[model samples]
Target: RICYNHLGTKPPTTETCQEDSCYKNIWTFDNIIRRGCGCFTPRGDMPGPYCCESDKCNL
Candidate 1:
């Protein structure tokens, strides 16, 4: 349950990881907005792989 443990231990607020093993410069230009985490995890099982789509278009 390593992944689950790590997932549960995520910081409640967006804070830069300072540890050597943690990411320093994680955010890229494409995903600089919001909390800067990668990809949107849609709830429930999808028919196939799904990408992020905002209010108007694919993002």
Candidate 2:
């Protein structure tokens, strides 16, 4: 599936990878929004994650 990828909001990029999941993280202290084709770690972490399974659903 496709997932949004970029460190900032402006001109965000997209990714098509081989992962079965997608994860999106929004940091509290910075202008950061991270998205990718797979979870950074198992289950959850500090910022947690916004996950989905459909095409481009991570956005």
Candidate 3:
């Protein structure tokens, strides 16, 4: 399925993610640092969601 996609908030744009699903990020700052578009596993500290299989699930 298509997904919510974006680079850093610094790029300041959102689009349809090509991955089957997407992941959203979390942070203490939460307001800044931004969050969207990661379909793979993480190394450590797990900055992103486990998974999202629906449209705009992260938004």
> How many clashes show up per model?
0, 0, 0
Q: Pick the candidate with the highest TM-score.
A: 2
RMSD of each: 14.3, 3.1, 5.0
Per residue, candidate 1 scores C-alpha lDDT tens digits across 1-59 of 00111222244233332221222122234433223222333424552322232221111
Question: How displaced is residue 17 in candidate 3, in Å?
Answer: 1.9
- Candidate 3, residue 42: Cα displacement in angstroms equals 0.9
Q: Would you give me the overall lDDT of model 3?
A: 0.51
Error of 1 at 57 (Å): 33
Selected candidate, larger lDDT, 1 vs 3: 3
Query: Model 1 compared with the native: what TM-score?
Result: 0.16
Q: After aligning candidate 2 to the native by TM-score, how far in Å is the CA of 31 from where it should be? A: 5.7
Model 2 residue runs over 4 Å out of place are: 27-31
Ranking by lDDT: 2, 3, 1
State residue 45's C-alpha deviation in candidate 2, in Å: 7.6
Tens digits of per-residue lDDT, candidate 2, 17-46, equal: 778677776752366666777765546565
Give the per-residue lDDT of model 3 (tens digit) for 29-53: 5354333545445525546444566
C-alpha lDDT of candidate 2 relative to the true structure: 0.67
* Cα-based TM-score, every candidate: 0.16, 0.63, 0.43
lDDT of 1 at 13: 38
